[PDB]
Amino acid sequence: ALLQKTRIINSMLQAAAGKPVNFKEMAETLRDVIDSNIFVVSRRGKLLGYSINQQIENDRMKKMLEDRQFPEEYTKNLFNVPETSSNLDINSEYTAFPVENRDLFQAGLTTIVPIIGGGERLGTLILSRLQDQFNDDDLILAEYGATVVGMEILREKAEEIEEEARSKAVVQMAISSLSYSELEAIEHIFEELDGNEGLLVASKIADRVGITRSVIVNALRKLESAGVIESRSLGMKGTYIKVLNNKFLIELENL
Amino acid sequence: ALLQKTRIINSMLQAAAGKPVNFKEMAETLRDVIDSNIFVVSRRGKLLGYSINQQIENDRMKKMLEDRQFPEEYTKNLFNVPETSSNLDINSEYTAFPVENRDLFQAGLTTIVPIIGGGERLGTLILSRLQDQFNDDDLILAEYGATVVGMEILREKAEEIEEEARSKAVVQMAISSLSYSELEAIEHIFEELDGNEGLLVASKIADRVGITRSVIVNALRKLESAGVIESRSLGMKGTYIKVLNNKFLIELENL
């Protein structure tokens, strides 16, 4: 039924497709397929997701869960595990962890799989059982699992930078197309405006600043047509604006 | 030794990391691990890579290889296989292929794994053997294999459109910065130039066309400053230019 088991993980990957990464979800699916407690811990050792199907009396663990994080101590110790290590209990004679960190295997069997992707140690996958051995098939699953979670940390962060940069880009591209006086205007406007939103009299700034209303508006138009702001007038004696690009205001500061 | 077999795939993936996707290589690695002929065919049914370890008398396939492509016929039929289909020979009674495409199984055992990733059917992985059956362990590997190829087809195509676009984008942005006269100049320059490279006398076009050297120059500057072209003079009685943006010439046409 192993083929089938891997097939699940396959479909769970295929499923997460266009949808924001959910670690808790993945944690569960693994928990189910491999039949073990599942813990997903970042490079920096932060707890990213987890799922439990058997209670295991472990202080260090419970504390870590409460903390949603590992102490630097362990975090490092963990990162230093270079490859899958399996079936570690408190009796395990081995290298990976120094004596005073063995409280991690206080009870039950633990397996450590590094999460590697995009040529980086991305984090670590922790599995624990009360007493059932991790045989090879388990390991296969666990490893495939970690591999998949890898690809998600990647998708996750990749999506992240694409947004950040794209938005910034667009702002710049828009700003670029401003005349001196247009930009001059925009600057004065948001110098005047009280953050993300608010309204002002276009025709008033025009006098106050020494720039035709016609261009002030024009400038607004450009920003709007690039989708950075949203503007609606109120039969003048008012015109109102909200920014729709979170990077915009910051970028504007940089000049 | 299955675990080990998967682990190869694993490190093959991890290996491809920062390096340009190569399908022939992956083909080989899978050929090796699965112990079967491997062919990687796109959504559009193009041949992407392949590797052979055993000769099989199959005209349809030899033909396909020569063509580096399938006929729309098969391409379609292939795409319609919704999930892994295994050990299909000429005698197989089943649904997947209409009997006029049976010539596909002319000889030996064929197995088809759809390549799915990022929520799309990305292509198809085809494996063939002269007579050894595909057991589950093979299918696990073959499927893990397809999966890996997946994220690569993705990466490859993604990188592809990121370059295409970015180039185009920057051309436009640079064009955007030009005066009527400046642009007019550019246009006559490349109308005069014979493709990607060559030289002319700036001062000559100036009279020929009715635009000051001074601006013709400055137009070139602008382009260069944006990294579109590369310009070096030769103490006049010559100035020389090379386009560094493959999209630029094309875009220019579109005006």
Residue numbers in the entry:
A (entry chain H), B (entry chain A): 2 to 256
Task: Give the exact sentences the study uses for this entry.
In low G + C Gram-positive bacteria, CodY is a global regulatory protein that controls the transcription of numerous genes. CodY from B. subtilis and most other low G + C Gram-positive bacteria is a DNA-binding protein that is activated by the branched-chain amino acids (BCAAs),2 leucine, isoleucine and valine, which may be viewed as signals of the metabolic status of the cell, and GTP, which may signal the energetic status of the cell. CodY from B. subtilis consists of 259 amino acid residues. The structures of full-length CodY from B. subtilis determined here reveal the effector binding domain and the DNA binding domain as discrete entities separated by a helical linker.
We have solved the structure of unliganded CodY in three different crystal forms containing 14 (form A), 10 (form B), and 2 (form C) molecules in the asymmetric unit from data sets extending to 4.6, 3.0, and 3.7 Å spacing, respectively. The following descriptions relate to the structure of the form B crystals, because these crystals diffracted to the highest resolution (3.0 Å). The full-length CodY protomer has an elongated structure that spans 80 Å in the longest dimension with a dumb-bell shape. The 12 residues (156–167) that link the previously reported GAF and wHTH domain structures are in an α-helical conformation. They extend helix α5 in the GAF domain and connect it to what was previously named helix α6 in the wHTH domain, thereby creating a single α-helix spanning residues 137–177. Within the CodY chain, there are no non-covalent interactions between the domains that exist as discrete entities. Examination of the molecular packing in the crystals of unliganded CodY reveals that the basic building block of all three crystals is a tetramer. The GAF domains exist as two pairs of dimers flanking four wHTH domains. To facilitate comparison, we superimposed the wHTH domains of one of the chains (chain A) of unliganded CodY and Ile-bound CodY(L3S) onto one of the corresponding domains of QsrR, FadR, and IscR in their DNA complexes and observed the juxtaposition of the recognition helix in the partner wHTH domains and the DNA. This simple modeling suggests that the unliganded CodY dimer, in which the recognition helices from each chain are related by a 25 Å translation and a 40° rotation, could bind to a DNA duplex of ∼20 bp.
